[PDB]
Write an enzyme that holds these catalytic residues in place. Sequence first.
Site, PDB file in Angstrom:
ATOM      1  N   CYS A  31     -86.310 -29.089  68.822  1.00  0.00           N
ATOM      2  CA  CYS A  31     -85.483 -29.020  70.009  1.00  0.00           C
ATOM      3  C   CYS A  31     -84.005 -29.192  69.690  1.00  0.00           C
ATOM      4  CB  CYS A  31     -85.903 -30.086  71.002  1.00  0.00           C
ATOM      5  SG  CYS A  31     -84.890 -30.066  72.484  1.00  0.00           S
ATOM      6  N   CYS A  34     -82.139 -31.938  71.867  1.00  0.00           N
ATOM      7  CA  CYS A  34     -82.535 -33.255  71.391  1.00  0.00           C
ATOM      8  C   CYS A  34     -81.581 -33.704  70.299  1.00  0.00           C
ATOM      9  CB  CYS A  34     -83.957 -33.247  70.857  1.00  0.00           C
ATOM     10  SG  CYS A  34     -85.195 -32.716  72.105  1.00  0.00           S
TER      11      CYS A  34
END
Length: 106
Positions: A31, A34
């Site tokens: 991600c 993230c």
Amino acid sequence: MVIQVTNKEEFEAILSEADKLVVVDFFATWCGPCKMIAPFFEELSEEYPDKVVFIKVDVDEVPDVAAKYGITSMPTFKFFKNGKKVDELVGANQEKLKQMILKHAP
Ligand SMILES: [Cl-]
Ligand SMILES: [Mg+2]
Ligand SMILES: [Mg+2]
Ligand code: NA
Ligand code: NA
């Protein structure tokens, strides 16, 4: 400090035993957002330790926790007080994350 939690038993123990607000970053290694918010989550953890416990869970390494808490995109931040969910933020908006911490840990 952000605490890495790598299994459901320890995850549940932390939630049921904490007196402080617990904020959980459910993230994945693949991600992109993230990675953007990770250093900000670390800064927050150093600024607010007296009132807040900061945890991170890799959804692919702890999938039973990701499933139980109904995660559907990353990052998702879930907020717990006294063992119960009190809020959540989907996505990596830094302003909203900080504000949600300030709200629940005055
Ligand atoms: Cl609250
Ligand atoms: Mg680190
Ligand atoms: Mg992975
Ligand atoms: Na605690
Ligand atoms: Na912490």
